[model samples]
Target chain A: ARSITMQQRIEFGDCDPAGIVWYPNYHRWLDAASRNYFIKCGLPPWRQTVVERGIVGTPIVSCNASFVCTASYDDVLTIETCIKEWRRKSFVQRHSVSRTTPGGDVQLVMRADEIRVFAMNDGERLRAIEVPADYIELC
Target chain B: ARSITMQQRIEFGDCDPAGIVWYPNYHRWLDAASRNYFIKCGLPPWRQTVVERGIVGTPIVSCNASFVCTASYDDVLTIETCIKEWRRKSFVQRHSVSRTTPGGDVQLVMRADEIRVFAMNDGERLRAIEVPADYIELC
Candidate 1:
């Protein structure tokens, strides 16, 4: 599996009153990892790719997730992004979130599968756009 | 399918410079609708469930979404939530976002299956609590 990992602190907004990471916060982490993976693979920064290039943004078409565990405040978590599958018009990416500890069991806090398609201007127009040749070639 | 719907205005934080909803903001909309659904089904208010009863909030463990369409500034959108599957330890809810217009074609903006679990004291500890009886009864 192609993977990219990163770390972030749990901020007030990212946590519940009890100081554990908020459930929705995982989405942010997952997205950050996914975007970073693209950058590591040599695509333009995700935002610039769409706004500056006029390349349609990849929009998620369907998603499903499983929560196998949870992470708490001050617990640095590692998120892994793996490109699971790609088709002509759509691609699926997998994400896993786990606590970051030395020799710690990489408990699977959550796993997600997202189906994405290239859409012109707000997904109003959908078409098959090749993943940037240079970007795809790197992967 | 059992359904729950809710509305939200386009807050500045909810949009991109392109004047359309940011991708992650859709999760908040769906979360709002799902929260309301719990209330409609007679579950305690979210604060009560989390604060008084020690129930941790719903977090998206995995999400698969398809951006079938888009919405822009000042657009009030409706999110519909339904049960795709329910298990003892976890439940899956599906969400769809659409512009609230008369006879509006409910373009499938995105579909997300959220996996939620209960936790104690801000996810400090995983609680293997059954899906609350009242919650399952409503379903």
Candidate 2:
């Protein structure tokens, strides 16, 4: 039941001409939040894993996301990320994005559920591997 | 059913340290493909719509995506985008990503179905609008 929260400030480039944050930017931030979650849970970086084991990184296989509210530049948002479930070869990660209003209220902006697998480089392709027991213990 | 295709050449910056294109980059490309679909369908740009109809842009409400294969830098991708369905106030857009191999075979990389709405700025909020008759005719 461990979770990690990361804070981000929306920049001008992150928003579209509609004056709201571009939808793709949310995926970028959520990806970062996913990595932060693992690192905060005492797991080594993927770079180290690539050296020790043949593991490269977690690659998402499927994702479903919903945008509940629109956000714009100059807003400070927080992404709460955690592993919702663990499968034999894949896991489900969840991210919730929200921003605090000036009146001290938090508004839910978006949420995403992603299914990913730890993969190893197999020649020119990536092959999903079983979840490492040690890695699971660390998490 | 009308479809439009957009081509993009992957860049080094688009790839992560794992030496493959990051997943979020696909979403960015799909966003561009979505705009391209409307433009190719003879619809006015969102900027012009903002002035003519008080409409800003098509904002995403939900998205479901599946990654079939991984791509790397220097790969040229073709995104085929089309409107799958039209609702009262929202529409479903679909995108298929693929790359042609040296043997002239197409490899499917990913696909996404996005639900979006044409929105207007109402004070500080975005309000979804009914599908414009003229817009539907153009598409």
Best TM-score among the predictions, by candidate number: 2
Off by over 4 Å in 1: A46-53, A101-106, A118-128, B46-54, B57-64, B101-106, B117-124
Off by over 4 Å in 2: B102-105
DockQ of 2: 0.91
What lDDT score belongs to each candidate, Candidate 1 first? 0.67, 0.90
Residue-level lDDT of model 2, residues B64-96, one tens digit each, is: 999998887777899999899999999999999
Candidate topping DockQ: 2
Q: Compared with the true structure, what per-residue lDDT tens digits does model 1 show for residues B1-139?
A: 2788777777677766556676777776776777777778777866787767777665554555666666666667777888788877777788777775335544555556666654455333556466777778776
Q: What would the TM-scores of all predictions be?
A: 0.80, 0.96
lDDT score of residue A47 within candidate 2: 82
Best by lDDT: 2
Task: Give the fraction of true interface contacts kept by model 1.
Answer: 0.67
lDDT value, residue B88 of candidate 2: 98
